[PDB]
Symmetry: D2
Subunit: 117 residues, 4 copies
Protein backbone atom coordinates (compact mmCIF):
# COMPACT_ATOMS: atom_id res chain seq x y z
CA UNK A 1 0.00 0.00 0.00
CA UNK A 2 2.85 2.36 0.87
CA UNK A 3 6.04 2.85 -1.17
CA UNK A 4 8.14 2.20 1.96
CA UNK A 5 6.86 0.48 5.10
CA UNK A 6 9.39 -0.67 7.71
CA UNK A 7 8.29 -2.48 10.85
CA UNK A 8 10.04 -4.20 13.73
CA UNK A 9 9.14 -7.28 15.77
CA UNK A 10 10.75 -8.56 18.97
CA UNK A 11 11.90 -12.15 19.43
CA UNK A 12 12.22 -12.00 23.23
CA UNK A 13 8.81 -10.82 24.39
CA UNK A 14 7.04 -12.02 21.26
CA UNK A 15 5.67 -8.52 20.72
CA UNK A 16 6.21 -5.69 18.26
CA UNK A 17 8.99 -3.41 19.47
CA UNK A 18 7.96 -0.26 21.33
CA UNK A 19 9.77 3.09 21.30
CA UNK A 20 12.49 2.26 18.76
CA UNK A 21 13.94 5.18 16.81
CA UNK A 22 14.07 5.00 13.01
CA UNK A 23 16.11 7.19 10.65
CA UNK A 24 15.94 7.19 6.84
CA UNK A 25 18.58 8.64 4.53
CA UNK A 26 19.28 8.89 0.80
CA UNK A 27 22.49 8.78 -1.22
CA UNK A 28 23.10 12.13 -2.90
CA UNK A 29 25.11 12.72 -6.06
CA UNK A 30 28.21 13.42 -3.94
CA UNK A 31 27.81 10.11 -2.05
CA UNK A 32 26.63 11.89 1.11
CA UNK A 33 23.87 10.35 3.24
CA UNK A 34 21.51 13.30 3.32
CA UNK A 35 18.67 12.73 5.81
CA UNK A 36 15.40 11.82 4.11
CA UNK A 37 12.92 10.94 6.87
CA UNK A 38 12.67 9.87 10.50
CA UNK A 39 10.17 8.62 13.04
CA UNK A 40 9.50 6.41 16.03
CA UNK A 41 8.39 2.78 16.08
CA UNK A 42 4.77 2.58 17.20
CA UNK A 43 3.43 0.20 19.83
CA UNK A 44 2.26 -1.96 16.93
CA UNK A 45 5.93 -2.14 15.93
CA UNK A 46 5.33 -0.36 12.62
CA UNK A 47 6.71 2.91 11.23
CA UNK A 48 4.72 5.25 8.99
CA UNK A 49 4.88 8.81 7.73
CA UNK A 50 8.24 8.09 6.11
CA UNK A 51 7.54 9.20 2.54
CA UNK A 52 5.00 9.68 -0.23
CA UNK A 53 5.13 8.56 -3.85
CA UNK A 54 5.95 12.01 -5.26
CA UNK A 55 9.20 12.60 -3.36
CA UNK A 56 10.26 8.93 -3.52
CA UNK A 57 12.58 9.07 -6.53
CA UNK A 58 14.89 6.51 -8.11
CA UNK A 59 18.15 6.04 -6.26
CA UNK A 60 19.84 4.35 -3.32
CA UNK A 61 18.12 4.57 0.06
CA UNK A 62 19.08 3.57 3.58
CA UNK A 63 16.87 2.73 6.57
CA UNK A 64 18.40 2.82 10.06
CA UNK A 65 16.77 1.38 13.18
CA UNK A 66 18.12 2.35 16.61
CA UNK A 67 18.34 -0.94 18.51
CA UNK A 68 21.22 -0.11 20.85
CA UNK A 69 19.33 2.14 23.26
CA UNK A 70 16.09 0.16 22.98
CA UNK A 71 17.68 -2.80 24.75
CA UNK A 72 19.21 -0.58 27.44
CA UNK A 73 15.70 0.69 28.15
CA UNK A 74 14.58 -2.87 28.89
CA UNK A 75 17.79 -3.69 30.77
CA UNK A 76 19.65 -5.88 28.25
CA UNK A 77 23.04 -5.00 26.76
CA UNK A 78 22.80 -5.72 23.01
CA UNK A 79 25.36 -6.39 20.28
CA UNK A 80 24.45 -4.22 17.29
CA UNK A 81 24.49 -0.44 17.51
CA UNK A 82 21.76 -0.24 14.85
CA UNK A 83 20.30 -2.01 11.81
CA UNK A 84 20.78 -0.71 8.27
CA UNK A 85 18.99 -1.70 5.05
CA UNK A 86 20.32 -0.39 1.73
CA UNK A 87 18.35 -0.94 -1.46
CA UNK A 88 17.58 0.46 -4.90
CA UNK A 89 14.09 1.89 -5.35
CA UNK A 90 12.01 2.64 -8.45
CA UNK A 91 14.72 1.28 -10.74
CA UNK A 92 12.30 0.43 -13.57
CA UNK A 93 9.14 2.19 -12.40
CA UNK A 94 6.96 2.68 -9.33
CA UNK A 95 6.94 -0.28 -6.95
CA UNK A 96 5.88 -0.92 -3.34
CA UNK A 97 8.63 -1.99 -0.93
CA UNK A 98 7.97 -3.56 2.47
CA UNK A 99 10.84 -3.94 4.94
CA UNK A 100 10.74 -6.21 7.98
CA UNK A 101 13.02 -6.49 11.01
CA UNK A 102 13.01 -9.30 13.58
CA UNK A 103 15.26 -8.07 16.34
CA UNK A 104 16.89 -9.84 19.26
CA UNK A 105 19.54 -8.97 21.85
CA UNK A 106 22.25 -10.38 19.58
CA UNK A 107 20.56 -10.84 16.17
CA UNK A 108 18.13 -9.56 13.56
CA UNK A 109 16.90 -10.34 10.06
CA UNK A 110 15.51 -8.40 7.12
CA UNK A 111 13.09 -9.20 4.31
CA UNK A 112 11.70 -7.30 1.34
CA UNK A 113 8.38 -7.53 -0.47
CA UNK A 114 7.91 -5.89 -3.87
CA UNK A 115 4.38 -5.45 -5.20
CA UNK A 116 5.43 -4.68 -8.80
CA UNK A 117 2.21 -2.96 -9.99
CA UNK B 1 31.53 -36.01 11.29
CA UNK B 2 28.10 -37.13 10.08
CA UNK B 3 25.88 -37.07 6.96
CA UNK B 4 23.30 -35.04 8.94
CA UNK B 5 24.61 -32.06 10.92
CA UNK B 6 22.28 -29.94 13.07
CA UNK B 7 23.59 -26.62 14.40
CA UNK B 8 21.57 -24.81 17.06
CA UNK B 9 22.30 -21.18 17.96
CA UNK B 10 20.82 -19.00 20.70
CA UNK B 11 19.96 -15.43 19.78
CA UNK B 12 19.36 -13.67 23.10
CA UNK B 13 22.61 -14.98 24.58
CA UNK B 14 24.47 -14.88 21.26
CA UNK B 15 25.86 -18.34 21.99
CA UNK B 16 25.27 -21.82 20.68
CA UNK B 17 22.57 -23.36 22.83
CA UNK B 18 23.52 -26.04 25.35
CA UNK B 19 21.56 -29.01 26.72
CA UNK B 20 19.15 -29.06 23.76
CA UNK B 21 17.67 -32.47 23.01
CA UNK B 22 17.72 -33.64 19.39
CA UNK B 23 15.71 -36.55 17.98
CA UNK B 24 15.81 -37.95 14.44
CA UNK B 25 13.08 -40.01 12.77
CA UNK B 26 12.80 -41.90 9.50
CA UNK B 27 9.50 -42.52 7.72
CA UNK B 28 8.76 -46.20 7.19
CA UNK B 29 6.70 -47.93 4.50
CA UNK B 30 3.67 -47.81 6.83
CA UNK B 31 3.69 -43.97 6.86
CA UNK B 32 4.75 -43.94 10.52
CA UNK B 33 7.58 -42.16 12.32
CA UNK B 34 10.12 -44.31 14.15
CA UNK B 35 13.21 -43.39 16.18
CA UNK B 36 16.38 -43.28 14.10
CA UNK B 37 18.80 -41.31 16.28
CA UNK B 38 18.82 -39.07 19.33
CA UNK B 39 21.15 -37.04 21.51
CA UNK B 40 21.85 -33.76 23.26
CA UNK B 41 23.34 -30.55 21.90
CA UNK B 42 26.96 -29.93 22.85
CA UNK B 43 28.50 -26.70 24.12
CA UNK B 44 29.28 -25.74 20.51
CA UNK B 45 25.63 -25.97 19.47
CA UNK B 46 26.26 -28.66 16.85
CA UNK B 47 25.07 -32.22 16.33
CA UNK B 48 27.56 -34.81 15.09
CA UNK B 49 27.73 -38.57 14.68
CA UNK B 50 23.97 -38.90 14.23
CA UNK B 51 24.02 -41.25 11.23
CA UNK B 52 26.40 -42.92 8.78
CA UNK B 53 26.61 -43.46 5.04
CA UNK B 54 25.38 -47.04 5.44
CA UNK B 55 22.45 -45.92 7.61
CA UNK B 56 21.50 -43.05 5.29
CA UNK B 57 18.97 -44.19 2.68
CA UNK B 58 16.63 -42.54 0.17
CA UNK B 59 13.36 -41.74 1.92
CA UNK B 60 11.64 -39.13 4.07
CA UNK B 61 13.28 -37.98 7.31
CA UNK B 62 12.48 -35.68 10.22
CA UNK B 63 14.68 -33.83 12.72
CA UNK B 64 13.26 -32.79 16.10
CA UNK B 65 14.83 -30.15 18.35
CA UNK B 66 13.58 -29.67 21.92
CA UNK B 67 13.40 -25.99 22.87
CA UNK B 68 10.92 -25.60 25.73
CA UNK B 69 13.09 -27.66 28.07
CA UNK B 70 16.02 -25.48 27.00
CA UNK B 71 14.34 -22.17 27.85
CA UNK B 72 12.65 -23.33 31.06
CA UNK B 73 16.07 -24.15 32.50
CA UNK B 74 17.17 -20.55 31.89
CA UNK B 75 14.20 -18.92 33.63
CA UNK B 76 12.30 -17.77 30.52
CA UNK B 77 8.95 -19.19 29.46
CA UNK B 78 9.18 -19.96 25.72
CA UNK B 79 6.47 -20.32 23.08
CA UNK B 80 7.26 -23.22 20.74
CA UNK B 81 6.74 -26.79 21.88
CA UNK B 82 9.70 -27.89 19.74
CA UNK B 83 11.38 -27.32 16.39
CA UNK B 84 10.98 -29.95 13.68
CA UNK B 85 12.36 -30.19 10.14
CA UNK B 86 10.75 -32.58 7.64
CA UNK B 87 12.28 -33.12 4.23
CA UNK B 88 13.01 -35.59 1.48
CA UNK B 89 16.58 -36.83 1.36
CA UNK B 90 18.97 -38.80 -0.86
CA UNK B 91 16.34 -39.32 -3.57
CA UNK B 92 18.69 -37.96 -6.25
CA UNK B 93 21.79 -39.79 -5.01
CA UNK B 94 24.35 -39.42 -2.22
CA UNK B 95 24.72 -35.77 -1.18
CA UNK B 96 25.34 -33.99 2.12
CA UNK B 97 22.68 -32.16 4.13
CA UNK B 98 23.42 -29.87 7.08
CA UNK B 99 20.55 -28.15 8.88
CA UNK B 100 20.95 -24.96 10.91
CA UNK B 101 18.46 -23.75 13.51
CA UNK B 102 18.66 -20.31 15.13
CA UNK B 103 16.57 -20.32 18.29
CA UNK B 104 14.82 -17.57 20.24
CA UNK B 105 12.30 -17.46 23.10
CA UNK B 106 9.53 -16.77 20.58
CA UNK B 107 11.04 -17.60 17.18
CA UNK B 108 13.29 -19.98 15.26
CA UNK B 109 14.69 -20.26 11.75
CA UNK B 110 15.68 -23.27 9.65
CA UNK B 111 18.09 -23.48 6.71
CA UNK B 112 19.53 -26.40 4.76
CA UNK B 113 22.81 -26.12 2.86
CA UNK B 114 23.74 -28.99 0.54
CA UNK B 115 27.27 -29.89 -0.58
CA UNK B 116 28.14 -32.59 -3.08
CA UNK B 117 30.65 -35.25 -1.90
CA UNK C 1 -8.84 -10.44 15.08
CA UNK C 2 -8.58 -14.20 14.62
CA UNK C 3 -6.94 -16.07 17.52
CA UNK C 4 -4.48 -17.77 15.15
CA UNK C 5 -3.24 -16.18 11.92
CA UNK C 6 -0.63 -17.86 9.71
CA UNK C 7 0.94 -16.17 6.70
CA UNK C 8 3.67 -17.08 4.24
CA UNK C 9 6.14 -14.88 2.35
CA UNK C 10 8.31 -15.86 -0.62
CA UNK C 11 11.88 -14.60 -0.51
CA UNK C 12 12.82 -15.43 -4.11
CA UNK C 13 10.33 -13.12 -5.82
CA UNK C 14 9.83 -10.88 -2.80
CA UNK C 15 6.09 -11.57 -2.78
CA UNK C 16 3.64 -13.48 -0.60
CA UNK C 17 3.34 -17.14 -1.50
CA UNK C 18 0.54 -18.28 -3.83
CA UNK C 19 -1.55 -21.46 -3.73
CA UNK C 20 0.16 -22.93 -0.67
CA UNK C 21 -2.04 -25.43 1.15
CA UNK C 22 -2.35 -24.98 4.92
CA UNK C 23 -3.53 -27.68 7.32
CA UNK C 24 -4.07 -27.15 11.06
CA UNK C 25 -4.27 -30.02 13.54
CA UNK C 26 -4.84 -30.28 17.29
CA UNK C 27 -3.27 -32.78 19.67
CA UNK C 28 -5.97 -35.08 21.02
CA UNK C 29 -5.88 -36.81 24.41
CA UNK C 30 -4.60 -40.02 22.77
CA UNK C 31 -1.57 -38.21 21.26
CA UNK C 32 -3.27 -38.24 17.85
CA UNK C 33 -3.16 -35.30 15.43
CA UNK C 34 -6.84 -35.05 14.66
CA UNK C 35 -7.59 -32.46 11.95
CA UNK C 36 -8.72 -29.08 13.26
CA UNK C 37 -8.79 -26.74 10.25
CA UNK C 38 -7.40 -26.37 6.75
CA UNK C 39 -7.23 -23.86 3.94
CA UNK C 40 -5.23 -22.34 1.11
CA UNK C 41 -2.79 -19.44 1.25
CA UNK C 42 -4.41 -16.43 -0.40
CA UNK C 43 -2.89 -14.25 -3.11
CA UNK C 44 -1.98 -11.88 -0.27
CA UNK C 45 -0.13 -14.74 1.44
CA UNK C 46 -2.35 -14.72 4.53
CA UNK C 47 -4.67 -17.36 6.00
CA UNK C 48 -7.47 -16.48 8.42
CA UNK C 49 -10.76 -17.92 9.61
CA UNK C 50 -9.18 -21.08 11.01
CA UNK C 51 -10.80 -20.94 14.45
CA UNK C 52 -12.73 -18.76 16.88
CA UNK C 53 -12.19 -18.11 20.58
CA UNK C 54 -14.62 -20.83 21.65
CA UNK C 55 -13.27 -23.52 19.30
CA UNK C 56 -9.63 -22.66 20.07
CA UNK C 57 -9.49 -24.61 23.32
CA UNK C 58 -6.39 -24.91 25.48
CA UNK C 59 -3.89 -27.55 24.39
CA UNK C 60 -1.16 -28.34 21.88
CA UNK C 61 -1.58 -27.42 18.22
CA UNK C 62 0.24 -27.96 14.93
CA UNK C 63 0.15 -25.74 11.84
CA UNK C 64 1.25 -27.46 8.63
CA UNK C 65 2.21 -25.66 5.41
CA UNK C 66 2.51 -27.49 2.09
CA UNK C 67 5.70 -26.20 0.46
CA UNK C 68 6.87 -29.17 -1.63
CA UNK C 69 4.12 -28.64 -4.20
CA UNK C 70 4.65 -24.87 -4.14
CA UNK C 71 8.15 -24.92 -5.63
CA UNK C 72 7.40 -27.80 -8.01
CA UNK C 73 4.69 -25.71 -9.66
CA UNK C 74 7.09 -22.85 -10.38
CA UNK C 75 9.98 -25.01 -11.60
CA UNK C 76 12.22 -25.21 -8.51
CA UNK C 77 13.17 -28.47 -6.82
CA UNK C 78 12.23 -28.11 -3.13
CA UNK C 79 14.17 -29.26 -0.12
CA UNK C 80 11.50 -29.41 2.59
CA UNK C 81 8.39 -31.52 2.13
CA UNK C 82 6.37 -29.23 4.43
CA UNK C 83 6.69 -26.72 7.26
CA UNK C 84 5.12 -27.35 10.66
CA UNK C 85 4.85 -25.26 13.83
CA UNK C 86 3.91 -26.86 17.16
CA UNK C 87 3.14 -24.83 20.27
CA UNK C 88 1.11 -24.66 23.45
CA UNK C 89 -1.88 -22.34 23.48
CA UNK C 90 -4.44 -20.67 25.74
CA UNK C 91 -2.44 -21.02 28.94
CA UNK C 92 -4.48 -18.13 30.37
CA UNK C 93 -6.85 -16.37 27.99
CA UNK C 94 -7.05 -16.56 24.19
CA UNK C 95 -4.00 -14.27 23.77
CA UNK C 96 -4.49 -14.01 19.97
CA UNK C 97 -1.44 -15.95 18.80
CA UNK C 98 0.16 -15.08 15.45
CA UNK C 99 2.37 -17.35 13.32
CA UNK C 100 4.51 -15.96 10.50
CA UNK C 101 6.49 -17.94 7.92
CA UNK C 102 9.13 -16.71 5.46
CA UNK C 103 9.84 -19.14 2.63
CA UNK C 104 12.93 -19.78 0.54
CA UNK C 105 13.56 -22.82 -1.68
CA UNK C 106 16.08 -24.26 0.79
CA UNK C 107 15.25 -22.33 3.97
CA UNK C 108 12.35 -21.03 6.04
CA UNK C 109 11.84 -19.11 9.26
CA UNK C 110 8.91 -18.84 11.67
CA UNK C 111 8.03 -16.29 14.34
CA UNK C 112 5.31 -15.93 16.95
CA UNK C 113 3.60 -12.80 18.26
CA UNK C 114 1.62 -13.04 21.51
CA UNK C 115 -0.71 -10.37 22.90
CA UNK C 116 -3.29 -9.95 25.67
CA UNK C 117 -6.72 -8.70 24.51
CA UNK D 1 40.75 -13.85 13.36
CA UNK D 2 38.57 -12.24 16.04
CA UNK D 3 35.94 -11.42 13.39
CA UNK D 4 34.52 -14.06 11.05
CA UNK D 5 31.97 -13.53 8.28
CA UNK D 6 30.04 -16.67 7.34
CA UNK D 7 27.59 -16.45 4.45
CA UNK D 8 25.13 -18.94 2.94
CA UNK D 9 22.71 -18.94 0.01
CA UNK D 10 19.07 -19.86 0.58
CA UNK D 11 18.23 -20.50 -3.09
CA UNK D 12 20.99 -22.88 -4.12
CA UNK D 13 21.50 -24.17 -0.58
CA UNK D 14 25.25 -23.59 -0.81
CA UNK D 15 27.65 -21.11 0.76
CA UNK D 16 27.89 -17.96 -1.31
CA UNK D 17 31.01 -17.60 -3.45
CA UNK D 18 32.70 -14.64 -5.14
CA UNK D 19 31.13 -12.07 -2.80
CA UNK D 20 33.27 -9.25 -1.46
CA UNK D 21 33.61 -8.35 2.22
CA UNK D 22 34.82 -4.98 3.52
CA UNK D 23 35.51 -3.89 7.10
CA UNK D 24 35.71 -0.31 8.38
CA UNK D 25 36.61 1.59 11.54
CA UNK D 26 34.76 4.41 13.29
CA UNK D 27 37.20 7.30 13.54
CA UNK D 28 37.00 10.03 16.17
CA UNK D 29 35.93 12.42 13.38
CA UNK D 30 32.98 10.11 12.51
CA UNK D 31 34.74 8.93 9.34
CA UNK D 32 34.83 5.29 8.22
CA UNK D 33 38.45 4.17 7.99
CA UNK D 34 38.80 1.04 5.83
CA UNK D 35 40.14 -1.82 7.93
CA UNK D 36 40.18 -5.01 5.84
CA UNK D 37 38.73 -6.49 2.66
CA UNK D 38 38.47 -9.76 0.79
CA UNK D 39 36.37 -12.10 -1.32
CA UNK D 40 34.46 -15.07 0.07
CA UNK D 41 35.86 -18.54 -0.57
CA UNK D 42 33.99 -21.67 -1.65
CA UNK D 43 33.11 -22.37 2.00
CA UNK D 44 31.37 -19.02 2.47
CA UNK D 45 33.59 -18.12 5.44
CA UNK D 46 36.33 -15.53 5.97
CA UNK D 47 39.37 -15.63 8.24
CA UNK D 48 42.65 -13.78 8.55
CA UNK D 49 41.00 -10.39 8.03
CA UNK D 50 41.67 -9.26 11.62
CA UNK D 51 44.36 -9.66 14.27
CA UNK D 52 44.59 -8.86 17.98
CA UNK D 53 47.27 -6.32 17.08
CA UNK D 54 44.77 -4.54 14.80
CA UNK D 55 41.49 -5.61 16.45
CA UNK D 56 41.03 -2.88 19.07
CA UNK D 57 38.17 -1.47 21.12
CA UNK D 58 35.77 0.90 19.41
CA UNK D 59 33.05 0.74 16.77
CA UNK D 60 33.45 -1.43 13.67
CA UNK D 61 31.40 -2.21 10.57
CA UNK D 62 31.20 -5.14 8.14
CA UNK D 63 29.84 -4.83 4.60
CA UNK D 64 29.05 -7.83 2.39
CA UNK D 65 28.70 -7.04 -1.32
CA UNK D 66 25.72 -9.01 -2.65
CA UNK D 67 24.35 -6.87 -5.49
CA UNK D 68 26.85 -8.24 -8.00
CA UNK D 69 26.35 -11.84 -6.85
CA UNK D 70 22.79 -12.28 -8.10
CA UNK D 71 23.59 -10.45 -11.34
CA UNK D 72 26.33 -13.00 -11.94
CA UNK D 73 23.77 -15.78 -11.48
CA UNK D 74 21.05 -14.16 -13.59
CA UNK D 75 18.78 -12.76 -10.85
CA UNK D 76 17.87 -9.15 -10.16
CA UNK D 77 18.30 -8.69 -6.39
CA UNK D 78 16.96 -6.09 -3.97
CA UNK D 79 19.70 -5.07 -1.53
CA UNK D 80 23.07 -3.61 -2.42
CA UNK D 81 24.96 -4.83 0.64
CA UNK D 82 24.53 -5.99 4.22
CA UNK D 83 25.94 -3.81 7.00
CA UNK D 84 26.60 -5.08 10.53
CA UNK D 85 27.45 -2.19 12.86
CA UNK D 86 28.49 -2.89 16.42
CA UNK D 87 30.88 -2.14 19.25
CA UNK D 88 33.84 -4.39 19.96
CA UNK D 89 36.01 -5.32 22.95
CA UNK D 90 34.13 -3.19 25.45
CA UNK D 91 35.75 -5.14 28.32
CA UNK D 92 38.29 -7.81 27.43
CA UNK D 93 39.06 -9.50 24.12
CA UNK D 94 36.57 -12.01 22.75
CA UNK D 95 35.74 -13.85 19.54
CA UNK D 96 32.93 -12.46 17.37
CA UNK D 97 31.24 -14.66 14.76
CA UNK D 98 28.91 -12.82 12.39
CA UNK D 99 26.75 -15.01 10.16
CA UNK D 100 24.64 -13.96 7.20
CA UNK D 101 22.01 -16.00 5.34
CA UNK D 102 21.60 -14.50 1.88
CA UNK D 103 18.73 -14.71 -0.56
CA UNK D 104 17.14 -12.43 -3.14
CA UNK D 105 15.02 -9.84 -1.33
CA UNK D 106 16.03 -11.19 2.10
CA UNK D 107 18.94 -11.70 4.48
CA UNK D 108 19.62 -12.33 8.16
CA UNK D 109 22.38 -11.80 10.71
CA UNK D 110 23.35 -13.40 14.02
CA UNK D 111 26.35 -12.60 16.21
CA UNK D 112 28.05 -15.31 18.26
CA UNK D 113 30.33 -14.15 21.08
CA UNK D 114 32.91 -16.40 22.74
CA UNK D 115 34.66 -15.48 25.98
CA UNK D 116 38.22 -16.26 24.75
O1 LIG E 1 7.21 -12.89 7.35
C1 LIG E 1 7.81 -13.49 8.26
O2 LIG E 1 7.53 -14.64 8.63
C2 LIG E 1 8.94 -12.78 8.94
C3 LIG E 1 9.71 -13.51 9.84
C4 LIG E 1 10.77 -12.95 10.51
C5 LIG E 1 11.08 -11.63 10.30
C6 LIG E 1 10.35 -10.87 9.41
C7 LIG E 1 9.26 -11.42 8.72
N1 LIG E 1 8.52 -10.63 7.82
C8 LIG E 1 7.22 -10.15 8.00
C9 LIG E 1 6.57 -10.34 9.22
C10 LIG E 1 5.29 -9.87 9.38
CL1 LIG E 1 4.48 -10.10 10.89
C11 LIG E 1 4.62 -9.20 8.35
O3 LIG E 1 3.35 -8.73 8.52
C12 LIG E 1 5.30 -9.02 7.13
CL2 LIG E 1 4.50 -8.20 5.84
C13 LIG E 1 6.58 -9.48 6.95
Amino acid sequence: KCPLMVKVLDAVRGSPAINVAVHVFRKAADDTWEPFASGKTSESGELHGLTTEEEFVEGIYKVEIDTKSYWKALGISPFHEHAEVVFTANDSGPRRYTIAALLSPYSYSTTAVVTNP
